[PDB]
Amino acid sequence: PTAAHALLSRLRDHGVGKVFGVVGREAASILFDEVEGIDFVLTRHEFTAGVAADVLARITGRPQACWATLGPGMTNLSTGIATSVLDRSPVIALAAQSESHDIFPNDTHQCLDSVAIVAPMSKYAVELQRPHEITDLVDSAVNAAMTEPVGPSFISLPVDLLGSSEGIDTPNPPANTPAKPVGVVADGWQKAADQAAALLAEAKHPVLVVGAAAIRSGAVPAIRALAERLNIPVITTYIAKGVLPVGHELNYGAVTGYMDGILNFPALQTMFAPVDLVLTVGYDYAEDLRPSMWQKGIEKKTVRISPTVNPIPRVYRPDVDVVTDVLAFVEHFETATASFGAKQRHDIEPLRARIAEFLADPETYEDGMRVHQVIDSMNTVMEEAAEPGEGTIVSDIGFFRHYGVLFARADQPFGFLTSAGCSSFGYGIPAAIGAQMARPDQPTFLIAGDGGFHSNSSDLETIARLNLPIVTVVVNNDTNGLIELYQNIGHHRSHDPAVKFGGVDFVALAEANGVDATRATNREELLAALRKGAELGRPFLIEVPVNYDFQPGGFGALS
Amino acid sequence: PTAAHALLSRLRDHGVGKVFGVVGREAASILFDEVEGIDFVLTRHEFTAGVAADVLARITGRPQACWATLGPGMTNLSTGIATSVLDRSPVIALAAQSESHDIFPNDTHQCLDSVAIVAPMSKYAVELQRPHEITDLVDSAVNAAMTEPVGPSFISLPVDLLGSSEGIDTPNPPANTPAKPVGVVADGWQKAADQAAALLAEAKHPVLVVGAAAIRSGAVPAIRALAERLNIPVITTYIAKGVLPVGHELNYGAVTGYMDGILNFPALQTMFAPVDLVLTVGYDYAEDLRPSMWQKGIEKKTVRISPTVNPIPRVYRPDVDVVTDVLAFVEHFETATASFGAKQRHDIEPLRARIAEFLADPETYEDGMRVHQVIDSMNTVMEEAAEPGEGTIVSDIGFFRHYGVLFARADQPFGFLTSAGCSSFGYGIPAAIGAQMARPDQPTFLIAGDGGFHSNSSDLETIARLNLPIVTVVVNNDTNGLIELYQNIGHHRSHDPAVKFGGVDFVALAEANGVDATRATNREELLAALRKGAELGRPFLIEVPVNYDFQPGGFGALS
Amino acid sequence: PTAAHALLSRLRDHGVGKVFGVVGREAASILFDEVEGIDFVLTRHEFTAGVAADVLARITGRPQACWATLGPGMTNLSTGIATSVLDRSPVIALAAQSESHDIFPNDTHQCLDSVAIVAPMSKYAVELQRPHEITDLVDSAVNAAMTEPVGPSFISLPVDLLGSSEGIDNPPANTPAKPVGVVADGWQKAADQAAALLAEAKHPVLVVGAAAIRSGAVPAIRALAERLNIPVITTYIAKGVLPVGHELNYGAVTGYMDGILNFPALQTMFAPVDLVLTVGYDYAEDLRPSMWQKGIEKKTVRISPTVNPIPRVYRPDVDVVTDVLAFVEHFETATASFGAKQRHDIEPLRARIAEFLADPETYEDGMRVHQVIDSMNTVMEEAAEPGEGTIVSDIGFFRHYGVLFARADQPFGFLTSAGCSSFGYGIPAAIGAQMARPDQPTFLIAGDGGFHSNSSDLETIARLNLPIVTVVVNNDTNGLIELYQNIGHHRSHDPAVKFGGVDFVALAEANGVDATRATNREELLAALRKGAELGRPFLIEVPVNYDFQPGGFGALS
């Protein structure tokens, strides 16, 4: 009864039921059957393991776990670790190491200096040295992972020590897993919150800009109630879509810096130009809603609320900085603003008409579908398939992803999932896995482009193996499309060798992994394929040819 | 006329004609058309890019180059960088970074502290800060990469700075690209080489254990002629197979720690038991030919020759350490042993008969073929399709790979290619891309297992796009088979969730990528498929079902 | 029979006979009497320890050892370690650490992440984990320390493991006799391209750095300079590769020399030169290309047992990566048939230097440093056998006087820190020099700022009874820093550079070191001569001033 047993056992004490990963030669020291209640989920690549853990942690609000072997196992896991550190999830990342007496980084076969490599991208990074201490190392790893900003903690596991029973006796101290993240609180945050209240009283047209940290804090209903009483519009980051239901009058949409260019419309100015006060509730620069995007029209005052000290004062100098828990802020703020008269909210109907018209685009095109037609079709079938307040749409990374930000339906928090911080291509499959496992009885759709999807398409076999009924839509234009956009922004022409592919048959690709698939080229075909996939009870994949029709004109918000 | 131009231009100055990678939003600062004579080679994943550069650099003996975007681009590339640092190749690894004024690691969108992450796995790692200095940074990278132990040098490139002309005026100074690696040389190595010559004189059965460093030094012809004259047997690491031709009487084969167990034979004993002196020529612990593998039978004396100070005295205390250039050691050694009488070489025919017995195995099995029969067939068609002294068989990582070490034909240096130091699965495809480009007119076969091959299978599309006529054999037992072996060694049983896959049709998978394919299930079908493949003028893939029937007991030498 | 025994024992196997340091609570695990032939040398501060080890290692060409306790011990040592890495010496730096099971950097009492802190300023840094491995850690440390650029290797020692016998039940040491270096393929060819440039050149020179001394290349370089009539210019510590008076000894360079001499000295030394061969080049020594780039563009040849670390600054026309001696030997063969050269004229500069050193004036306030060093040279020529003696200089403005004017009659006859240049360097460098040359005279000159930064080790000099003679030149100021205020801002600001008075005579005497005051040439010469024959340490304080000219130091940019 070994450090391997103690490791899995202590993960179980913190609520972990799954370890995602790829096991290497450390299998001699750990089978993964040591502890009842914890199953191994084998992936085809370690990146998929890390991201699935990241996403499962986001939705459940609980620490999750991933696994890799030494050397290149750990470097492959590192892109999932990076997904967790930038996107913010409590992930315990574990990787094997050469035998302790044989650790010579870059000399011993497969031996890298794992801790030096991972420390800069993690909350906590350590190497096991005495087997019995693994219990305290898991606890210190959970501790750091669950402190804002939440993130991954890394433990490197030399193979001999992982298989040793030395110092281990068969009375586990309580876990005390935080039920929500530990945050930082400044003295006199209440006073700063009052100052923010005084700005709100003076303001004629305020907004709440909500980030995901507001969801982790459990502040969604409270923010909604605040917004409704005072008639304050709510604008979101990519993943805070769904903090208000679809069709709510205060749901002013999500922001992407690509929105003016995509909609051929002055969207950011319509959203922000008349605004005189911006409250960034649960702000986090990594979500990529930057100050420059709301600095439109008149001068604005700002209020930052975050359970962290502001790491970017070069970029964001709020008039009022409130360092405290988000829910605690909203409760204090409700009391301070109880006497305030409801505001007159600014008009964004022209932007709403523009969005609705992109989604309703009834044209049939020569080359492919347009991505807005694809998402609108995905919305229709999601709403049919899902109970109200349920369903997840997931987006991989690419130009199409920003169409997801503007157009995809989100009827609950995390109802639209993508990687805002790290934005690694191929994120889609592992995210759809994590999401479907978190929400077992809910439809899970994935949209991905050909570039990013194929970067990580091999874990289609994992989707089949686990029998997760994810419906995937690959939008194909045989290009790294986002990158062709940037070629054009910077140089006013393309260069195909850096961005162009030959053909891939994603239908045939899906079928080789044992996933049923079909091609769809217009709304009618796409709708039928989605509805078949949703009702299939097995995963399903739909390939859709697309084109973008871009005009490098309106993309200045990207500077 | 920008730092992008100055970067690509200085790579062209050091001989580089290709840059492998994936390009992100830095495409706004760099098209990859700025410089005649350097082309971009787009992959589906950055790992592929870094490994192709590593192999192309190994075979050409000249610095090569790979490329990634910021954040996850850089971390994906790092498995390639780790390949380069552990296998020893001179790679210039390049990654974009957030705009210089906006570099806040783990806060700014996609911003990771790239230098801190890569420095522990590289020879040199730096961030560009003033545009015109990109010329001297490239040189300093080449400098550190071409010093032994050769390895990767990393440059992080903030997007603003890459695209800036500030400080750049177009007359470039001379490159002085080292023609072969700069190495370290101890004072008095001539004296230590004479002590080694005196030990050779007084020895009944010496051997030369030859590592890849000896090939890098250009020492192969010289080693051959010393071995021939004095009747000294030559034993090699995985990748130094072919330093003598196949059939040569002194070609005593390659060592792998897995050999007694695969062969069910005391192969290490037969190979080393009566040997009284081991000359490890170009020794490098990373190749995984460890002292404990030749420590069989009688007390041996050892002589280490390397162009590096000994990094692992805990594990290898040679009787004579000769720190110098390998070629210079051999020339001095010829001089001091010119009048010595030739030796009686020891008999290893029992081992040879056992290896030949595996290769000739004519049994049809109920389940699939056996990997030794798979490799025998590849040897036959490689000898047919390749000129003498030519051809490359490439191996991915897994249990099958060590069958490769024992059985695969290699008629020149690097005629058998696999990753000996880092051993990342998915290696095969990119190593074969690199091998095929370095040897445009030679046949290039790849063998990979299903675990490893599917880990990086998406880059079949790259093989089709570049039209490289690589013949790929996938050996499929629906298992991470090597890992199931380690489960059985450690625990005396399997655990399927950590190692077992569902069905993947690699024939259909390849064809979905634009590569023609076919299933072969016995020697007759395999030979027919391999013959077709080698004559197609197009890539081809062959799926072969296999099984291992392993014997967990005979792998003691792995500890 | 403990890891402590095994560590000391392996240090003895590598020639080490002294460990310099300060011992903390790790004394419970290590006494320093476990091995005959290795003694402990207690200092007052760990910096002194590290620097004494660095200087003993440079002069002896052999690895040396220093020691500190955990946390602040190790950080104190680190200025010593920084001295070794920048100045180039093979030092084994040893520090204790918290018990292995209690290592929580920045939470455990006195616990710092020692390896992370020292890795960036060392050749090798590691923490002990299993007691018996200390033997191989010591060997890997010596290996990395004795590879060019030579430098310090650090081993962190948790107290429990240090005092444990677990697994402890010896193989040969193989200490390199001289540094391991790198060597490019085609270096013989690049050295021939250099000989072709020496043939086509009218006024070549040899700029020599200390790495030529480590290579054992000094005799060989003399011969090549004599036969081909090439002048030899040096870095601060390569002074004395040619004897005093030798016609080819063109002295040492320092970017402060134009400004101090009030004379276009670099112009004189380098204007008409057309080929510069930087023999054993090392940018850390602070003789930079800008200092020889006077007049006509020169061609340059670099010769170092290392690849060029600084191509942004020094792009030689020819780069010869190889051992220095081996380069010289191969260059002799290629230049065997060459006729001697016409060496350009620098008498005007020699005359200005001599004129400084002879300065007979008597200044109201106190002496001038050029007069102090002249008096030092005179008494050192008397006291010391020929080819012998050591003048050590601490850091500050006066040190650049030391570079120009101080007598060096052997390699390392003038000692200062060229690379790291920490003030307080002087005492420990004089301690190490005196120990390496037990029967030679050892003089130290230091300023009041630097001397006082590390003056407490006067008691160590007394305790070890090393007959060093120290001259503290006191102007109640960090004078060098006042100069830089004036270069940058055209005025002074006293709160950043001025002290009140310190009586260094009384300070010395408080430490049990005899001392006296001296205010002119005659008082100074009597003090030095008394001190050189005292058979005990001795200190002399001399009031000085500088009256410097800010506008003449354009060369420092």
Ligand SMILES: Cc1ncc(C[n+]2csc(CCOP(=O)(O)OP(=O)(O)O)c2C)c(N)n1
């Ligand atoms: C790991 C990684 N490398 C490079 C990039 C740059 N990049 C971002 S999304 C993307 C994919 C774009 O192509 P695709 O998935 O087809 O979407 P499209 O833009 O064509 O709609 C790429 C290459 C990235 N995001 N992640």
Ligand SMILES: Cc1ncc(C[n+]2csc(CCOP(=O)(O)OP(=O)(O)O)c2C)c(N)n1
């Ligand atoms: C990047 C990476 N992760 C994990 C491993 C552990 N591992 C080594 S090879 C391998 C693949 C083994 O399966 P397969 O390629 O089919 O070869 P087989 O052993 O079945 O013959 C695995 C999972 C690895 N080598 N590299």
Ligand SMILES: Cc1ncc(C[n+]2csc(CCOP(=O)(O)OP(=O)(O)O)c2C)c(N)n1
């Ligand atoms: C550790 C350290 N801190 C600060 C300095 C800057 N500095 C260099 S030498 C020196 C001393 C200058 O005064 P002093 O030793 O009296 O010599 P002076 O310039 O007066 O001749 C100082 C402060 C330094 N060299 N080293």
Ligand SMILES: [Mg+2]
């Ligand atoms: Mg695309």
Ligand SMILES: [Mg+2]
């Ligand atoms: Mg397999």
Ligand SMILES: [Mg+2]
């Ligand atoms: Mg002073």
